[PDB]
Amino acid sequence: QAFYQVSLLDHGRSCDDVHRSRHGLSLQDQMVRKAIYGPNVISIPVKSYPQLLVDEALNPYYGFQAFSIALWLADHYYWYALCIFLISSISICLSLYKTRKQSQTLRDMVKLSMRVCVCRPGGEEEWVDSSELVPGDCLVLPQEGGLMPCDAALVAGECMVNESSLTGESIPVLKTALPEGLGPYCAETHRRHTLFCGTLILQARAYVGPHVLAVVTRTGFCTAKGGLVSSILHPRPINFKFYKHSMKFVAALSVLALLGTIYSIFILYRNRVPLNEIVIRALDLVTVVVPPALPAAMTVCTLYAQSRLRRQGIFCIHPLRINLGGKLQLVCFDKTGTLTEDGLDVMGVVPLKGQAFLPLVPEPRRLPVGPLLRALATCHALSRLQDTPVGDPMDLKMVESTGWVLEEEPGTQVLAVMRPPLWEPPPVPVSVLHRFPFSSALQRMSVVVAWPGATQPEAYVKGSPELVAGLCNPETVPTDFAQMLQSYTAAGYRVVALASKPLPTVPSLEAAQQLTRDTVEGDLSLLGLLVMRNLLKPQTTPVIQALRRTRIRAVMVTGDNLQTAVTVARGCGMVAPQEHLIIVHATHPERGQPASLEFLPMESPSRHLALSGPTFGIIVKHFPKLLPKVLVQGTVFARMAPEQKTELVCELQKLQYCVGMCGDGANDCGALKAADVGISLSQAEASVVSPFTSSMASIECVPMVIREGRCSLDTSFSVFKYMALYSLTQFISVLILYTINTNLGDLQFLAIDLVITTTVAVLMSRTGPALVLGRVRPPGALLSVPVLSSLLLQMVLVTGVQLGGYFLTLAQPWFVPLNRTVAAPDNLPNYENTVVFSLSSFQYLILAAAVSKGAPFRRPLYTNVPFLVALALLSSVLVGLVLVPGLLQGPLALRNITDTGFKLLLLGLVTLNFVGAFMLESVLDQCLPACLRRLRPKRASKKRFKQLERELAEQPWPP
Ligand SMILES: Nc1ncnc2c1ncn2[C@@H]1O[C@H](COP(=O)(O)OP(=O)(O)CP(=O)(O)O)[C@@H](O)[C@H]1O
Ligand SMILES: [Mg+2]
Numbered sequence: 001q002a003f004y005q006v007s008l009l010d011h012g013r014s015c016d017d018v019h020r021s022r023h024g025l026s027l028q029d030q031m032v033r034k035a036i037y038g039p040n041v042i043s044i045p046v047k048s049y050p051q052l053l054v055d056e057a058l059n060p061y062y063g064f065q066a067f068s069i070a071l072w073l074a075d076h077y078y079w080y081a082l083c084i085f086l087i088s089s090i091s092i093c094l095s096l097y098k099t100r101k102q103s104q105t106l107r108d109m110v111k112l113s114m115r116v117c118v119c120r121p122g123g124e125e126e127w128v129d130s131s132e133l134v135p136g137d138c139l140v141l142p143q144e145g146g147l148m149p150c151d152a153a154l155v156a157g158e159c160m161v162n163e164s165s166l167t168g169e170s171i172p173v174l175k176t177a178l179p180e181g182l183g184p185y186c187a188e189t190h191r192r193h194t195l196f197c198g199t200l201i202l203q204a205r206a207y208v209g210p211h212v213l214a215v216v217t218r219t220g221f222c223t224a225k226g227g228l229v230s231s232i233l234h235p236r237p238i239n240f241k242f243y244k245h246s247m248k249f250v251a252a253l254s255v256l257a258l259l260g261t262i263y264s265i266f267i268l269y270r271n272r273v274p275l276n277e278i279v280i281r282a283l284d285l286v287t288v289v290v291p292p293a294l295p296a297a298m299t300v301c302t303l304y305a306q307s308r309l310r311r312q313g314i315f316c317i318h319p320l321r322i323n324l325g326g327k328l329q330l331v332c333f334d335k336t337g338t339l340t341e342d343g344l345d346v347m348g349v350v351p352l353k354g355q356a357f358l359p360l361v362p363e364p365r366r367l368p369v370g371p372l373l374r375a376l377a378t379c380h381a382l383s384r385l386q387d388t389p390v391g392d393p394m395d396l397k398m399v400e401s402t403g404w405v406l407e408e409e410p411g412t413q414v415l416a417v418m419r420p421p422l423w424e425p426p427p428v429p430v431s432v433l434h435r436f437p438f439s440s441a442l443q444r445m446s447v448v449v450a451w452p453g454a455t456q457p458e459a460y461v462k463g464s465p466e467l468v469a470g471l472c473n474p475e476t477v478p479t480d481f482a483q484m485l486q487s488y489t490a491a492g493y494r495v496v497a498l499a500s501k502p503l504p505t506v507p508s509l510e511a512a513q514q515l516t517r518d519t520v521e522g523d524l525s526l527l528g529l530l531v532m533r534n535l536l537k538p539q540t541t542p543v544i545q546a547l548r549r550t551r552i553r554a555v556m557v558t559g560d561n562l563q564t565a566v567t568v569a570r571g572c573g574m575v576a577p578q579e580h581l582i583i584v585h586a587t588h589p590e591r592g593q594p595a596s597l598e599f600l601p602m603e604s605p606s607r608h609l610a611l612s613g614p615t616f617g618i619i620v621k622h623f624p625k626l627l628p629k630v631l632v633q634g635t636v637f638a639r640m641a642p643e644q645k646t647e648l649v650c651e652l653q654k655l656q657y658c659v660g661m662c663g664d665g666a667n668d669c670g671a672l673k674a675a676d677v678g679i680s681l682s683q684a685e686a687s688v689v690s691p692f693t694s695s696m697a698s699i700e701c702v703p704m705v706i707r708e709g710r711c712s713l714d715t716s717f718s719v720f721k722y723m724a725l726y727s728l729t730q731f732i733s734v735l736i737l738y739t740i741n742t743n744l745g746d747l748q749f750l751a752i753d754l755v756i757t758t759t760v761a762v763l764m765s766r767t768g769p770a771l772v773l774g775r776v777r778p779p780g781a782l783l784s785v786p787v788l789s790s791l792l793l794q795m796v797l798v799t800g801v802q803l804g805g806y807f808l809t810l811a812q813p814w815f816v817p818l819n820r821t822v823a824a825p826d827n828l829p830n831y832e833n834t835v836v837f838s839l840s841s842f843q844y845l846i847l848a849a850a851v852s853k854g855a856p857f858r859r860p861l862y863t864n865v866p867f868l869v870a871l872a873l874l875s876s877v878l879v880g881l882v883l884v885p886g887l888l889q890g891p892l893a894l895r896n897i898t899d900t901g902f903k904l905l906l907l908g909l910v911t912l913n914f915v916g917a918f919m920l921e922s923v924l925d926q927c928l929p930a931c932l933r934r935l936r937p938k939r940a941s942k943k944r945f946k947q948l949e950r951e952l953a954e955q956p957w958p959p
Contacts, residue, residue: 006037006135006222013217015181021136022155022215026120030134037135040150042110042221042229044103056096061295062088068287075280076825080749084292087758091296098299105317105686106229110221112198116149117142119213135219141212146201151224152214153178153187153194157206158415158435160383160390163199166224167666168680168689172202172390174381174437179514187217192437198225202390203383207413208510228688235318238676242323242780246720249783253724257289260731267739277823281738288730293758294723301719301765305712308768312704313695314679315686323716325677325692325709326778326857329945330652331547331660331702332645332671335558335568336494338664338681338699339544340534343393346401347493347531349376355478360531364401369426371500372528375460377404377418378432378449379498384408392438394496394532413510433457434513436520440559440667441641443467446520450507457507459520461499465529465561466639468497472524485529489563492571494532499524536571543699544572550773552706555652557637557645559667562612565638566602574635575608582957584611584630586618595622599958607956610636613644620647629957631655632948645671656943661690662702677705703773711769713778714857719765720782721791722851726757726844728795733840736802741820743830747891748837752844756874760848763867767858778857785935790924794850794917798843801913802836805906809835812902834895835906838882842910843917845875850917853925882906 014020024030034040065088072081115127119138133139133150141148141159148161159175167173178193187194195201195214204212222230264285268278302319309316316322333339348362351372367373380399382391389396389406399406407417413433420427430451438445444463461468465485469477478484488495501524505512544554554574558565562583569575581602589595595618602610611619611634619627631651640648645663649671652659661668661675664682672678672690679701680690687693694701730752737743779786809815809832818831849871852861862868883903885894897903940947 006220007218010135010217011186012184013186014184015179017184018153018178018187018215018217019155019180022138022213023119023121024134024136024138024215026123026125030132030137033135034132037220039131040133040220041131042107042226044107044110044229044233046107052096052099053092056092056099059295061290062092064287064290065292068290071280071283071287075284077744077746077749079746080753083750083754086754087292087296090758091293091299094296094299094303098303102317102319106232109686109688110198110226110229112147114147114149133216133219135216138213138215141195141201141204141214144201144203146204148195148199148201149197150216150219151187151194151197152216152219153190154212154214156209157204157212159195159204159212160202161195161199162202163196163666164683165687165689166196166199167669168664168672168683168687169666170682171392172383174383174435176435176437188223192439196224202385205415207415225688232317232688238320238324242716242782245780246782249724249787252783252788253289253727256728256731257286260289260735261285263735264738268742271742273742281742284744285731285734285738288734289727291723291727292753293761294720296758297719297723297761297765298716300762301712301715304766305708305715308708309704312708314701314705314708315693315695316691317686317693318691321677321691322709323713324658325660325705326711326713327658327709327780328552328660328677328706329658330553330555331662331677332555332557332649332652332675333661333699334663334665334668335556335560335565336534336665337697338662339537339540339556339568339572341537342664342682342697344397344494344532344534346397347533349528349530350484350488351528352476352478352526355476357478357480357484364398365403365421369428371458371460372498373402374430374449374451374458375462375498375500375527376530377402378416378430378447379445379460379462381435381437381445382406382416394494397532398530411508413513414508428453431508433508434515434520436517438463440665441643443559444471444521446517448503448505448513448515448520454507455502457503457505457512459501459503460527461501461521461524462496462530463499464639465495465497468499468524469526471521472499472526476525478526481526485561486563488529488531489561490567492534492564492567494534494560494564496530496532498527498530500527501525536568537698539698539700540572543703544574546703546773547706548573548576550706550775553635555635555637555648557640557648557663557671559613559640559642560638562610562636562638565636566610569610569636570604577604579606579608581608581610581636584609584615584619584634586615586623588618589622597623597626607633607952608635609633609957610638613637613639613641616640616644616648620651627651628655628944628948629952632657632945633952633957642667642670646674649674655945655948657945660702660705662699664697677709679705704769707769707773710774710778710857711767713780715765715767717779717782717787718851718853718858719761721787722764722848723761724791725794725847725851728791729798729840729844729847732795732799732802733836736799736806737832737836740806740832741818741830742824743818743827743833744824745833745837745893746825747893748833751892752837752841756841756844759870759874760845760867763864763870764848764852766866767852767854767861767864770855770857770859774856776856785931786924786928789931790921793924794847794920797913797916797920801843801909801916802839805835805839805909806832808902808905808909812899814899828893829895830893831895833893834897837892838894839906839909841878841882842875843913845871845878846910846914846917849914850921853921879907 069081069084113130116130117126117140118128154175156177160172161175163173164170175195206212305322306316306319348360349364350360351358361367380395382389384406403421405419407419414431417431419429428451430449432447433450434448436446446461448457448459450457469481547554556569556574575581583600585598587596637648649659659675660677661672662679678690679692679694681694681697683693854861881888
């Protein structure tokens, strides 16, 4: 009767229900469920070519150009029509290629199919089906190096998986068996028992089970790998798109088009040409005003910039966003693996005798056998790859520091058995009973471990110092824990605390392993603090100094302790030594206490604010009025959960800041997607994780993403402004002829539009970006006073030389006056056509050189090379032709002029116009300040960040 959403069909499923779904029906249920859900295939439509063309041809411009071709054919200017078709043909081919390439990349990612082993309710079939996989299907996963087709909760056993594409996470991720329960929660809601579509399985092992077996949850390409590709198809728009502002500027040109049309009507009525004939002249005037090569030129800008970035390694999707890069005002960054260096030496461990802390051991090897050694060795979730161990750089560096070595493939639920170094001045090899994974939001990991001693099993928890110390029973927790940790965090050593609890369970029993994560991480005794050292990436310190110099503010968003983030921030130059840092702190509103905000300064040898994640939680919920003041003044957001990083992005955006994210981790995945410009620095090739994936492991990417964006925004504005200048230069030329004896050209018009303008337009879009990022932001409105001024003033100079030419031509003593008794197509030679075309041809080229204006955002014009050769070549051909048309006289329909003097006068006028155009654009750059000061002495931006800044300047936060 009424359709129900697949999510709505499977939203309320129990923990038990996922196990109920396991060993699902072989065929009848499969077929009906598969029919209801639809086939498990990516929904990218496949088009041979002509299938695309019909859809592609529906664009409104294409219709107008088709009408224009017919109109020009009716006028019998075949040659101009021959060009007008050909330029549209180039436009459609390039648009087709652009569209085809954009789909092809995405389609190539999702073009994967492989034979799958599927479990029957009383069966275990092998390689039976893949694309037809049942929505609730249970399957046995491959042993090693196996891509996972569907998002499936793991019912039994443990899996090691590479999720690098899905989460931006190169490091191997542990997967564990789901626990059946009366409560219903989604596998995604667990966010760990689920195995995600298109993720490689490094290894798969069942300690107790015969093999690892998983039950499919959300599937059919509409979740995970496809859910993101599906996002890339029909993508999210940008608000207040600059094309609207350009569309307003087209309306200013539309007034000029109407004014021209009425001028023509008066001239034609005065001329007394047939009314039927006058309509064709009016129609030609309107069609001429439309530029044929603009639609192609706009594509070629983007395609050249994608080409420029692909070579730099910054692999891009949604190429429209490269301009958005140009406008970004703040760039958010992550601490570890981006601002700092991935991989960290363990700078020893600190042990505690009783309540008191003992002095730090430089090398973890020289310590007594007991809890801390075992915890240091066993806490990690490292697995053994071919002749090697694979894990998180922190956990890997810790175990190598202990000197204990992981046992290989060769009880029941016994895994990752830890072999001792076997050097003595007890070896007691130890085996893990239960593994708990580390979640960035959760901020800790835990293990249950047993030994041949066969005592009560001991649970070891390694996690964030504050949460672990808080979780520990306050018996062992030292009085000065906070102050002692403050030494290590202030130094800049990433610190993780280890807590041990003896657990009263039956040792080496599978059943005994089953336990509540909270119950294992409940009552705890603080054991020691690890002192991991992460060092700043060499290039980070430079890029941040430039981004601060441009006045694009750099905000740091991190899950690590506030003092470490303050040390990294003070190091990079987020906060310079001259600058002052305030630590906003908040007390929870609860019992008899209301919410309190306390601001405490920090002093070290622009009023920068550093906020812990929890303080920001209270500020957003219980101080909404203050949030604008902190988020416009906050530089070092720290101890932030993965969800909190998205909130900073969203609140900074609602304050009208253009955010950017250069994170390299699963924690940032949310923030990267939400942010305007998102860059994932550790990914290989194009990926769905971020809009602008990089393959260089540095912040050196981010300046390049801004620098190219500003170039693409200036190229888009230059190509638009040159296309307007050409059309009005054509309008003036065609009109000067329309008044004067009702004449035009055919082959001449093909030559101008096809060779002079289309070649220059495509070639002017490949200049490339400026060397150094600049203080001045690229101008963002096409309908600006400078742009409008520049175009209008230049067109006056165009007309001046053009009219001057005609006056000089008529004034020439040898000049023979033209017949002016016969139709424009019939009068193949006209003495005026020769002069007007010959003067106008060169000026069409000159406009591009003046328009280029290559300095703040683009490199000097000469550096282009293919443009510069073409400009000179076409100029040389035109110089050659104007002096001596020879053979080309006949095709050009040129009236041969023997007199050298008038040709030199004509060359002089073009040179004068050229000098004029260059002088006008240089004058325009110099004149802007005087104009701006007089037009507006002072103004206030509607955007909230610029006002809140100005308010804070007038009255600061309480000092
Ligand atoms: N394997 C592990 N087991 C337990 N805790 C870990 C851990 N690896 C990191 N931690 C700690 O867990 C907390 C949360 O880490 P999270 O992934 O959110 O950020 P992070 O410390 O990697 C800094 P960044 O945000 O720059 O990536 C931190 O205090 C971190 O030091
Ligand atoms: Mg990271």
